[PDB]
Design a protein around this nucleic acid. Structure first.
Ligand SMILES: [Cl-]
Ligand SMILES: [Cl-]
Ligand SMILES: [Cl-]
Ligand SMILES: [Cl-]
Ligand SMILES: [Cl-]
Ligand SMILES: [Cl-]
Ligand SMILES: [Mg+2]
Ligand SMILES: [Mg+2]
Ligand SMILES: [Mg+2]
Ligand SMILES: [Mg+2]
Lengths: 224, 229, 224, 229
DNA sequence: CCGGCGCCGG
DNA sequence: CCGGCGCCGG
């Protein structure tokens, strides 16, 4: 009866045709998005205007990002589950344009290195039976003049949509043979030199797990 | 086939003798703690030193606050479910010294105006049929000199435990019939003059809902009718 | 292959018609003996001369007590599983006269208080469906002038038969209803006033478990 | 129906990486430890401080020796399976610092003549096909002024850990064909002049068997023919 | 053989 | 959610 008036809401999972997502109403962004990439889901007629994002009415208005929040902010609507990953079905690609699957992203990053990383991810489907992609924001602390560590990020728009300090991407590469291989990257939410090799943004999965509060490694060895 | 190898981050609920909490591994802090204050439960022989907190090993070490994180930080280990709310059962009281029921709190606040809000909450068990207390942190943005808004909060210890900018306490009060009276408070994580009446810190529940990402009103209203104070 | 030449021998259990026993070849006595007492096993024709003990040829001669070891020592051959507990079968009472079921016992104790304790044990079978009796020696330390603790006991005979410093008896009273009740006693191997109430020699089972190296309480709660 | 509620005291064997032991809960000490010394296993990078023993929690607390028992006792924690017999594998070597492989040993003995007997044992792995070492304590009676014999040994610590009066080491040596050569030693738990040749401490195996309650000869002879030294 | 403590840890 | 450490403990 300690829950007579329910519980103040907990982890909001959303199942879309092309990804699953854990929403953070506090930041008005996804904590993570999970895609399962295969070669056939990568081809097809699916298309959409680059700027055609719509708000997620399944998120309460108190905690829902809107297009107006992005207006004049200088940030792209960076999709986490990328639209080109889901050309196989117009509905499946449409679902990537919900704002709940986007985060404020510095435009030079969205167009260049972060895009490059997505291209790379799709290429690994020629070698791997399944490329699971888990994408999400990070908010990483910094030490200031006073010796103290602070998390500092801008919030944009009326609804204070959090602007991540970095993005992570975890590739869970499922071999046809059953070997699972992990490649995880972090890039700062900042203009990133298009010519730095993607490999140099690799980080140990554990540094990502530590910062994000997510765990993949115990979940992977559930059936490994 | 999309979750065949698990999901990275699920609802981190914890049911204790004295409260229910939802835990946030990114902040290493609860999102909210829920108690039902009964007057029966307010008196008893439960006691524990003020400085005797335990890390919560039910949280993976990567996201678990430890006592080393607080040491030398300048912050009190501020319990969200208050110790003195559960004196009837020592186990009930010990549960409040799990660090997952704690957040860095400015000591003058923890020991004064936040303490006074707790004592006032216990007082309402005398005058209402049920007192529910939902307590939690806030991280509220501020507008800076360039005109832009930013959330800025300190993190302490090797585990980067987040220092809240504010705290909220929502009282769900059961009047005689089926009337629920809501009463919500915000205090800044800062020295708060003890002499300011607690009613000066009331806020519309909606602002706590908006800022916290939590929802109280639709949950309560599926259970009669409401009188926001 | 770390056991190519076997193992230097380990815990010697013996199953007799009337008790089971764990033998200690180091002391040439039983570590414990276990009887299961019931009212019908207490009646019958079984009899034997009080002094008619025979040595246990199932024990190696190096570690086997003999009658000659007892000769002139001033100690009775105290039976642990008591002969009167097993009148129902001559073989079953005979088995109690193996020296492996005896220990050197001060005679005034064997005749009086220790005997009284055995009488008491048999009486509890009118109330309890099973009276399990576990009997054995203790060797308890003493502090001397130098502040140090020492175990000191005489050994008798050519074969150095250890003379216990005390005896324990644990009664495991099995109710018909399933309640198990424990009564455990310790008496010093010394002349004991026949008129002290048996209750005053009760001790917590744990003090017996600690000294002896036996455990009953975890074994009792195996099926309790 | 006679063991329907269990037996109070069974064989307390322990299999470790580096030895097999039989444990005695009354004495809180091993009855014997059995190793097979291979030369391969004698060299490696295994190391551990001389003072870094662990209590063996596989033994019930009521009968388990702890480091507090040895502290201030004046006795070395004397390992029976020697550390330097298992340098190939750190886990193998760490197993010898379980206190259930230890007995109170007079320091001058542990660090000198008993050490020399161990080094000599390792030396025999060069000259024999297999070296088996069985090591253990003794509690040997003494005749007193009243003409009667008594075993008297100190017990140390709150757990009353028994100080042996002597120690035995039995070497089972595999000669070229199938010949086993037996070689058994006794030293008193006391300062032993390091200069006395180790052969002066040989004894007939039978005396160790008689005193210890252990049997070696019939076990070996079910495996060819024997040459007692 | 279990259980615990505070602390560390994947 | 498990695992560990030394120490305590039934
Ligand atoms: Cl898809
Ligand atoms: Cl919502
Ligand atoms: Cl810090
Ligand atoms: Cl019988
Ligand atoms: Cl034997
Ligand atoms: Cl001592
Ligand atoms: Mg993009
Ligand atoms: Mg407080
Ligand atoms: Mg008798
Ligand atoms: Mg040594």
């Amino acid at each position: 009866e300690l829950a007579k008036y329910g519980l103040p809401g907990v982890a909001q999972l959303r199942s879309r045709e092309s990804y699953v997502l854990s929403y953070d109403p506090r930041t008005r962004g996804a904590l993570w998005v999970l895609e399962q990439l295969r070669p056939e889901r990568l081809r097809g007629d699916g298309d959409r205007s680059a700027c055609d994002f719509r708000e997620d009415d399944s998120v309460h208005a108190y905690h829902r990002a809107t297009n107006a929040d992005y207006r004049g902010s200088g940030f792209d609507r960076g999709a986490l589950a990328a639209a080109a990953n889901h050309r196989w079905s117009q509905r499946a690609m449409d679902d990537t344009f919900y704002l709940s699957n986007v985060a404020p992203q510095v435009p030079h990053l969205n167009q260049n290195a972060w895009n490059n990383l997505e291209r790379y991810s799709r290429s690994l489907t020629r070698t791997y039976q399944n490329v699971y992609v888990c994408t999400g924001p990070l908010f990483l602390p910094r030490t200031e003049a006073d010796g103290k560590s602070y998390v500092k990020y801008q919030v944009i728009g009326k609804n204070h949509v959090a602007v991540p300090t970095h993005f992570f991407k975890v590739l869970i590469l499922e071999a046809a043979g059953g070997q699972i291989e992990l490649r995880s990257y972090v890039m700062p939410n900042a203009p990133v030199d298009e010519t730095i090799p993607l490999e140099r943004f690799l980080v140990p999965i554990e540094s990502i797990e530590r910062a994000s509060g997510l765990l993949f490694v115990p979940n992977i060895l559930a059936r490994a």
